[PDB]
Every structure is written in C-alpha cells, then in structure tokens.
Design a protein around this ligand. Structure first.
Ligand code: DDQ
Ligand code: DDQ
Ligand code: DDQ
Ligand code: DDQ
Ligand code: K
Ligand code: K
Ligand code: K
Lengths: 282, 279, 282, 279
C-alpha cells in the first residue's frame, strides 16, 4: 500500500518541468545563506558598476589613483553606504550628479532589502504538536476516531480550527480509481481559546466514510487522514497553521489516549507532555 | 457581447486618491516619482541655504549647483566634509533637512513594501468547462492546479452563474447565481483540484441545454482564495467562462501519470486537454 | 424622532471622562501635522539632551566652542543623522562611547518612526459609494427593501460582504424601552468579485422586523438601518470596509432605483454613476 | 480549584525558538539585546582590522579602543574622516561592515515593527454574569464596552461553558460547551454590547441551579474578536468566569443616561453595577 501524503502533510509527488519572472516568490523561498549571498553579490556588482561610471566620466574623485577600480569601488561603497569619510570626494557637477543618483539607489536599494528581509521573517511556526498515532475507541456511545493536539508555547491560540480529511481511492459509477477527499465531521471543529491540549474527535455514525470499515479495509484502500490546524497566535498577533497526515496503519483500534493532565506532588494541577503520545488499551 | 472577460474583469467601460494611485502606477513610473521628489526636495533645500545666508563652505557663492549637491549629501547623510554648514542658519536647516530625509526614507520603504507584498496566487485555471456524468448525475466541472511547490492552506473556490433574466415585475436584469460545488473548501491544496457542480433540482443550470445558456447570455465566474504557504499571505485568483466555453459530455484527462522509476508525477501538459464520449 | 446613528454609521453619543499609557493608539490616531510635530519635537529634545551629555562630560568635541550648546546640539544632530561632516569630531574614549550609543539611538529611533509612519499609512479607504436613500419596491413578488453600492475604483473587491442591520427601540415583556439590533436577511450577503455596482436587497417576508410596518410606524419607533460593507481590495491586497446608516425618513416607498448601466453612442456597454442615486416611481 | 483565570489564561502549571522568544521578551530586555549585539559586532569588527593589518589612520596602533570606535562609526555610517581605512584589507572590511550594518538595521526595524503592531483590543468586560428573565425566558448575560472612540467592525463574541462531567464510557473529563448567544456577531461595535444566552431545551445550563454549576466546577470562557478601526488590524480580548461569579436574578443597570444639555452619554461608571429583583 503506497503512501501519497507524508507525515508532514506534503504530497510526495514530483511535477514536470523543474526548470526568472517569479522572482518575488524565489527571493522569499530561497534559504538564508543563499539570500544573504544574493544580497551580497548584488551589492558588490552594484558597487562595481557605479565604479566604472566614475571612471568612464573621467577622474573626478579626489585622492583617488586615476583609473584605479578599487578607489572608484571604495568611493562607491563609501557613497552607497553614505559613510563619506572625506579623502575620496567627487569633483565638479558631473561627479556629484552621479553621487546624487547613487545615494538615491542606496535609499531604495536598502528598502527592498528590508522588505525582503521582513517578509521572509514574519512566518511564525504554529508551535503545535500532533499525536504520533490515531486511536479509535468508544466515546459517548459511538466508536470515535480521535487524535490529539498540544500547544507547546505558553501563549494561547485564538480561533483555532481543525480540518480532518480522509483521502482515499474509490471507484465511481463510470468505473475509475480516482482519489477522493472526505471531510470528517468533528465533535468540535473550532476552539475559541487554545491554551494547552485539544483532543479532536470524529464520531463514526451514519455520516462517516469510515463507517463499517475494518482495519483490513482501510489498509487495502490506501486510506490516509489529512489534518489541518489553523488559528491566530497571541505571541505574534498573526495567523499560524500546521498540517499533518496519518495512514491506515498508523491508526490503532481500541486505543485509549493516556491522560495528559496529571497532579503534581505539591498540590497543583499540571500538564505532562511526556505522556502525549502514550496510548492505553481496553 | 460578453459581460466578463476570461480574467474575470468586467467588459463595461467605466465613465485626489493619492495612496491608491501610488500603489496603482507601474514600477517604472513609481521609480520616477521618487527621483523627481528627491531632486525637487534637494533643489528646494539648495535654494533655502542660498536664499538665507550663503554659508556653504568651499563652494562658489551664489552657485545653485554647489548648493544642490551639498543639500543632496546632507539629505543623503553622506557628509564628505568639504562642503560644511556655517553658522546657526545653515545648521538649523541641516537639522531640518536631516529630519526630512529620515522621514522621507521611512515613507519610501513604506510605499515600496506595500507594493511588492501583493503576491500573485500562481494558480492555473482550465481554459474550458465540461458538463458530464459523474456518478450518474451530470456535473459541471472545471479544475485548477498549483504552479508552485509550496501548498495553499484553506483553499476556497466560488463558482457563480452570471446570466440575464426577467423578473416577475417585468424588468430584465442580470442575476448572479451561486453554484453549489461538491467541495467548496480544500484544507490543503498542493497539486490539482477538480471542482464539480452537481446539476440537481436546486440548480440554476438544471433544465438548461447547449442553446438555452447561450440564448440567456449565461456566463460563469470563478474565484479562488487561500492562504499560500510561500508568502504567509492570503492569495487569490479569478477566472471566467461563457456559454460557448462549455463542452458537453467532456472529461478531463487524468493529470497523474507514472514515471519510469516509479515516481508519481503531475503531468500538467494534459491539464487543458479534454476527451469526449466516455473515457 | 431623534437620530442615534449618523449617516457615516458613527454613533452620535458622548462618553464620560474625556481625560499616556494608550500611547500606541494615540500615536496612530493623532493627525499628520500633529504626528510630524511629535516626531519633530521628540527629535529636537532628543538632540538637545545628547548635547548636554557632551557638555557634562567636558569639552570633547574638536572645533567646538567650549560650553556652547549649539555646537553640541549640532554635533548631536550630525551624529544622530550620521552625517559626520568632519570638523566637529569626538575626542578620547569617553566621547566616542557617547557617540557609539547615540548612533544606536539613531538606528532604533528611526525604525520606531518608520513603524509608526507605516502603520498610519496602510489604512486604505474602501472607495465604495452608498445610495443616498433606500427604496421599497416589489421584486420577485415580495415587497423588497433595497439600497445600492458602487465601486468607485477600477480594481475589484474580493469576498465582498454586506451586513444590513435594523436598529430600533422596542419593549420587552419586562417593560423597558431598549435599543435592539435586527439582522436583515439579504437575497445576497456575499459577492465573490465586486467590480461595479451591487444592489443589496432585503425581502420583506414572514422573517422580517419590517413586515407589517408602514411608513408612519418606522418613523414613530425611531427606526434606523445600519449598513456594513467588508471585502478584500485587489488594489492593496488588504482588507477594506465601509459603514453607513439610514433612517425611517430616508426610505421612500414605491421607489425604483434607476438603471445605472447605460448604452454608449458608440455601441459598447458602459456604467454611468450620475444616475446612481436617482429613483423612479411606479 | 479554578481551571481558568479571570483573564482567560489556564491555571495549569506547564511542565531554540528564537523568533518567538525575540517578540516574547519585555521591551527593556529587547533593547538590551540589540545593544549587546551591536557592541559585540563592533568589537569583533575592531579585532578584524587589528588582526589583519592595523591600518586605521590617526589612531594608536594596537589599541582596541580606537578600533572599536572606528568600527562603530563605520557600521553606523558616520564617517567623520579622522579615522579612515588604508589599503585593500581595511577597505574590504569596510565594504563588509557596511553590508552588515545595513542588513543589521533592516532586521532591527523588522523586529521592532512586529513587536509594536500587536495592539490591545481595549474592551472592558463585566466582572460578573447575571441570569435573569429577558422576555420571559431566563437568559445568561454578560456585557462588554468599547474604551476607544474608534469602532470595531465585525465584532464576534464566543461564550463557552467549561465544566467537568462523566461520559457514558465511565471516564471523567472536562468538556467545552458552546453557548448559543442571541447575537454572535455585531457588525459595528462602538459603545456597549450586552451578550445574552437564552437557556432553552438545547442549552447545557438548562436544568442547572446555583448549586449544580458549582458542584460540577463549571466555568465560563468568553472570547471577543473584531476588526478595530483605530489599528486597521484584528484585535481580540478574552475573559473568564466561574460558578460563583454568577448572580441569579440580576439586571445590568442601563449605561445610557442623559446630559443636562440633552446629549446622550455613555455612563461607564454603572457598567459593573447590577440590581437584583426586578428593575
Ligand atoms: C476542546 C477545546 C480545547 C481547549 C484547550 N484547552 C483550553 C483545554 O487547553
Ligand atoms: C476533492 C479534493 C481536492 C483536493 C486536492 C488535493 N491535492 C491533490 C491538491 O493535494
Ligand atoms: C450582486 C453581485 C454584484 C456583482 C458586482 N458586479 C460584478 C456586477 O459589478
Ligand atoms: C444587540 C446588538 C448590540 C450592538 C451594540 C451596538 N453599539 C451600541 C455598540 O453601537
Ligand atoms: K550616513
Ligand atoms: K556620513
Ligand atoms: K566626513
């Protein structure tokens, strides 16, 4: 039984034409060492280009060796960074018109760097933990499939949403083995304030694709369970999310999630995450 | 005589707002405005020093050229040292010009940032819709795919039927009918997604045919939204179709093939292709 | 009949204790001339304070008249703005330790200014026009209350929401004249793409507080109709909104909104907003 | 033995993450980290010039003090002129130190901005709830008010009943019941808003009394959200109550009085006051 979705929810599927006009997407998605290099490489090339302009207009930099690329590059660097030490200064109106434009490039050039830097950083992780496996035990009468979610950080999550999806290959009346996504109704699909742990539950009633399906049936149909958390974290005043996927083998039947809440020796209620993935039997 | 273009924009010809206009203009036009505003502010500040003292050291007195380039180095905080202010009159404007170039840069980064953090959704739409039997019932279909490795969270498609009809009150107009999709929200959208509208009793296309849709100038509007993982931002895309854009009895070719190694790939070359009859 | 809500939707109601710890709210809400002044005044006071520190540590500025506040202020200004002309320079380690901290103040001080500037600006107006008055005419059988909304800008609005609310004073079983807000169901409460004009409609059926209420009844009960538009504008990639309120007198019965769409002499369909507030009779 | 505090935080004691930690720490601790990181970077760059050439002009050779203050003026782009680099070794680090202080400022503005654009909602909650007859039926009530002139758009209140109960499976736990308010969303919230929960057949408080709620350790959680006009940002507030926080048969005193001139005012001094019996 092949697995289509990874444990992180990513679809393990290649796409043709790996193969820049999507630059803004590329700039935000490349790694930080590559991003620092791109800004570094762009910075030296941009200073190397302005240097030639000072050399092409003639020796218009005092205290600069005529025709020396370094002094023009290091006057550009001192002009681009607005250091303006004082030894190397421009001469006449033409050099200053090249300096007044270079400073304009320095102002706008920094802002685009600040923009790219800012947008790359404000991507806060949700900081929520998923249960290693799913369990199906009776709850309030019906047999209920359930998985757990823990908030690792102290700050609470507002408007917490959970979306449990069963992805499974079925056959239609036409007669094709296509992949179909089923929404699994939950006892609770919205938690106003998510502080600690949230045990998501799917009652298996008349309205459930899992109804009447044994352990062998889920495995032989390549059944997988896609999970999506969404909320508004208080720590960032920003929206955060998390995804995860289970397979038919990762569900254990008759399992009972061990109580995460314990009682400390002192006499205060506490939360032990060491028993978050623990499961009991009945 | 089409009301909606294929991109979603309305065909109807429309017969200060500074903040909107700033982000509206193109990137070259935006770069020009900063330059002009930067030069004029430096030109005005040059006329300031010249029109109240003429204290710019190591510079031709009365020459605006030396004053503009001192104002530049002062607003651009270069401070070479050759051109230096003299007396309280120049030092007062130096303090003000500095306060100008600092607030002036912050507004520059503010406008630049707001213009680039408006990312495209990167979603491809089918060039046509198919009306065929899915599990017996005839269902109107159109599919979309993701053109980026990153996934879109909480993806919502909205399919709207735009057509011209006559009310009981005797006035003809154009109403927008919300089509009921089998799935209105996909929690994780990473590859391709086929959107289906079952044509049942409570369906505005129910009873219609190839001709009746065209005769009423029926048009179909699609709206996709979702939280893109690449940008940590809500992205959206739009598309529209007409009656002549539907191919009855069509089926979208399966875009999921298999590589020689054994890897499952997304064949987006067969995304717009549609075979008729049964397949 | 007194009016509680203004035409802009603002509640015309004073609140006690006009009467800073809510500074962040104050900084964003004060007017721009006041905001520029606050940053200006903070800038001079901050440069005047650093100047005294250079004077209190002793004459440690070359080419500066000893004990002169201006030269210390204008060295601070040249140090705060990082101009560094060259005549006025610090002397010894103590002056430079005061300069290395002043530059740190200049970096952080600019960012807070840039932050306040940015947050004050990214408040885009929705750019949507409301109909001057409401009309109640028959539509699809039932008598339907309706008002119009026009998109002034070219860019379309995504996920456009309209919330029509009837605010009215009623009496409960206890016997109190309180204000009550009624949600008026609409034929359409959501427009995926808002390009041009949107005619909101409230059918007056069995589920409507306006049902069985004449013109005289709405006026004698101080009835008002609060309207809220909400959407995601394409021009800003940001959420925009608008509010508005009508009164019982602003509704005209039997009115028929004149068609906003016309036909140009050329032969193309066009949209004339000159007849947006026009109303016909039947 | 209270599970939720009056602010909404859970009482349960909990038994790198750099980006979260940066915004988490207090404002004084945040200012310190920049200073330390700024000094150490200048100290490292000073050791750079000294450890490869010693070319800082007009400075005591081998003295770290003169090198730190040159590195500062170079990273802080002051460029007085007395201390100037000499040769390619210093000019190369000057170019790099400049690239550092420029990327270093941009991350500084990035972290500062993210920390202040997290505004408080500015919403006051009632210190207690009342269960009284509104239009006959007994309705649980709690009200909130806006402490700012600016209005909140699309305001949503969420009232949740937290209590400990036993399942049919014989295990005792704590379930969260969503209370059904008469109004879950207020489009425009500018003054005061009274939230009511009618106790009907489908109500978890139905049949309960003053004692049964306390005996089951019942607690009430409230969550307010909305789009504040002052910040153009979504603000939220939270609050919680216990069984002992309810006053049965109580009524909130009307907060809308009248001024001598004739103006209608919002009397927030009588916001928490509640009269019993009938009023
Ligand atoms: C089910 C609601 C989850 C609430 C999370 N909690 C407050 C218990 O930590
Ligand atoms: C029907 C559900 C369609 C969801 C598509 C999921 N996807 C294949 C894109 O990962
Ligand atoms: C009712 C839907 C409003 C649509 C707005 N429109 C596209 C016509 O300009
Ligand atoms: C019941 C509806 C309550 C909405 C309150 C409106 N307000 C008085 C705050 O403007
Ligand atoms: K500078
Ligand atoms: K400088
Ligand atoms: K200098």
């Amino acid at each position: 039984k092949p697995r289509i979705l990874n444990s992180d929810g990513s679809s393990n599927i290649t796409r043709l034409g790996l193969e820049l006009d999507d630059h803004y997407h590329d700039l935000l998605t490349v790694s930080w060492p590559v991003f620092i290099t791109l800004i570094t490489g762009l910075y030296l090339v941009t200073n190397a280009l302005f240097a030639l302009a000072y050399l092409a207009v003639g020796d218009v930099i005092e205290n600069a060796r005529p025709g020396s690329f370094t002094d023009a590059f290091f006057f550009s660097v001192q002009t681009m960074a607005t250091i303006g030490y004082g030894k190397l200064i421009p001469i006449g109106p033409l050099a200053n018109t090249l300096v007044t434009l270079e400073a304009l490039v320095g102002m706008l050039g920094l802002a685009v760097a600040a923009c790219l830097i800012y947008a790359r950083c404000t991507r806060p992780t949700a900081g929520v933990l998923f249960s290693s496996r799913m369990v199906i035990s009776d709850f309030e009468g019906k047999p209920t499939l359930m998985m757990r979610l823990a908030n690792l950080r102290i700050e609470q999550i507002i408007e917490a949403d959970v979306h449990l999806v069963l992805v499974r290959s079925e056959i239609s009346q036409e007669g094709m083995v296509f992949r179909r996504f089923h929404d699994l109704t939950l006892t609770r699909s919205r938690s106003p304030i998510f502080s600690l742990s949230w045990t998501v539950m799917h009652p298996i009633d008349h309205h459930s694709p899992i109804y009447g399906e044994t352990d062998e049936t889920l495995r032989n149909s390549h059944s997988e369970f896609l999970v999506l958390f969404t909320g508004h974290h208080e720590a960032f005043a920003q929206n955060v999310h998390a995804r995860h996927a289970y397979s038919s083998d990762e569900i254990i039947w008759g399992g009972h999630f061990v109580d995460v809440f314990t009682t400390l020796p002192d006499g205060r209620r506490a939360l032990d995450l060491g028993k978050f993935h623990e499961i009991a039997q009945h």
